[PDB]
Amino acid sequence: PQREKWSSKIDFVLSVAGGFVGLGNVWRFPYLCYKNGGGAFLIPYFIFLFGSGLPVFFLEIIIGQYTSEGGITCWEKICPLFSGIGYASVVIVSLLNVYYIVILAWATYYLFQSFQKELPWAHCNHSWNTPHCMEDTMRKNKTNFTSPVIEFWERNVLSLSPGIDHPGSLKWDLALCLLLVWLVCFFCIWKGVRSTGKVVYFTATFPFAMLLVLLVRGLTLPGAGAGIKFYLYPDITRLEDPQVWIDAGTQIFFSYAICLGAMTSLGSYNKYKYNSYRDCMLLGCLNSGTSFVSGFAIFSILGFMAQEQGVDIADVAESGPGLAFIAYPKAVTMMPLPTFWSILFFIMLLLLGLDSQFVEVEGQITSLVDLYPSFLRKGYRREIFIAFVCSISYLLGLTMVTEGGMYVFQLFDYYAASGVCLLWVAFFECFVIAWIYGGDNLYDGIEDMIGYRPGPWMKYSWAVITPVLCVGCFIFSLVKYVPLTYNKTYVYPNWAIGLGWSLALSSMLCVPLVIVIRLCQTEGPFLVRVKYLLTPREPNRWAVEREGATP
Ligand X SMILES: *[C@@H]1O[C@H](CO)[C@@H](O)[C@H](O)[C@H]1NC(C)=O
Among 29, 394, 415, 428, binds Cl ion (CB under 5 A): 29
3-state secondary structure of 474: helix
Contact of residue 408 among ligand CCCCCCCCCCCC, ligand CCCCCCCC, ligand X, none (CB under 5-8 Å per partner type): none
Site for ligand CCCCCCCCCCCC in 497-516 (CB under 6 A): 506, 510, 513-514
> How many helical (H) and strand (E) elements, i.e. helices and strands, does the chain have?
27, 2
Site for Cl ion in 203-262 (CB under 5 A): 255
Among 392, 464, 491, 517, binds ligand CCCCCCCCCCCC (CB under 6 A): 517
Among 14, 79, 90, 422, binds ligand CCCCCCCC (CB under 6 A): 90
Q: What is the DSSP string of 369-422?
A: HHHSTTTSSSTHHHHHHHHHHHHHHHHHHGGGTBTTHHHHHHHIIIIISSSHHH
Nearest to 255 by CA among 13, 28, 551: 28
- Are the beta carbons of 539 and 445 closer than 8 angstroms? yes
Which of 120-128, 288-296, 417-425, 484-492 is the region at the interface with ligand CCCCCCCC (rule: CB under 6 A)? 288-296
Which of 116-124, 246-254, 286-294, 490-498 is the region at the interface with ligand CCCCCCCC (rule: CB under 6 A)? 286-294
Considering the rule CB under 6 A, would residue 293 count as an interface residue with ligand CCCCCC?
yes
Contacts of 34 (CB under 8 A, 6+ apart): 299, 302, 314, 317, 319, 323
For the window 427-466, what string marks contact with ligand CCCCCCCCCCCC as x by the rule CB under 6 A?
--------xx------------------------------
In the complex, least distance from residue 356 CB atom to Na ion, rounded to whole angstroms:
5
Rounded to whole angstroms, how far apart are CA atoms 419 and 223?
33
Considering the rule CB under 6 A, would residue 152 count as an interface residue with ligand CCCCCC?
no
Considering the rule CB under 6 A, would residue 399 count as an interface residue with ligand CCCCCCCCCCCC?
yes
Rounded to whole angstroms, how far apart are CA atoms 486 and 411?
9
Contact of residue 236 among ligand CCCCCCCC, ligand X, Na ion, none (CB under 5-8 Å per partner type): none
Rounded to whole angstroms, how far apart are CA atoms 49 and 189?
31
Please state, as a whole number, how many other Cβ atoms lie within 10 Å of the Cβ of residue 112. Answer: 14
Site for ligand CCCCCCCCCCCC in 153-212 (CB under 6 A): 167, 169-170
Nearest to 362 by CA among 486, 186, 239, 493: 186
Site for ligand CCCCCC in 104-143 (CB under 6 A): none
Rounded to 10°, the helix 276-309/242-255 angle is: 130
* Bridge partners for 490 per DSSP: 486
- Are the beta carbons of 304 and 317 closer than 8 angstroms? no
Rounded to whole angstroms, how far apart are CA atoms 301 and 299?
5
- Are the beta carbons of 33 and 295 closer than 8 angstroms? yes
- Are the beta carbons of 531 and 442 closer than 8 angstroms? no
Among 211, 262, 317, 470, binds ligand CCCCCCCC (CB under 6 A): 211
Among 31, 48, 153, 296, binds ligand CCCCCC (CB under 6 A): 296
In the complex, least distance from residue 144 CB atom to Cl ion, rounded to whole angstroms:
34
Contact of residue 436 among ligand CCCCCC, ligand CCCCCCCCCCCC, ligand X, none (CB under 5-8 Å per partner type): ligand CCCCCCCCCCCC
Considering the rule CB under 6 A, would residue 372 count as an interface residue with ligand CCCCCCCCCCCC?
no
- Are the beta carbons of 423 and 253 closer than 8 angstroms? yes
Rounded to whole angstroms, how far apart are CA atoms 534 and 431?
13
* Bridge partners for 485 per DSSP: 491
Q: Which residues bind Cl ion (CB under 5 A)?
A: 29, 255, 291
Q: Which residues bind ligand CCCCCC (CB under 6 A)?
A: 219, 228, 293, 296
Q: Which residues bind Na ion (CB under 5 A)?
A: 18, 20-22, 24-25, 255, 352, 355
Q: Which residues bind ligand CCCCCCCC (CB under 6 A)?
A: 87, 90-91, 94-95, 208, 211, 285-286, 289-290, 293, 371, 520
Q: Which residues bind ligand CCCCCCCCCCCC (CB under 6 A)?
A: 87, 91, 167, 169-170, 395, 398-399, 402, 435-436, 506, 510, 513-514, 517, 534
Q: Which residues bind ligand X (CB under 6 A)?
A: 143-144
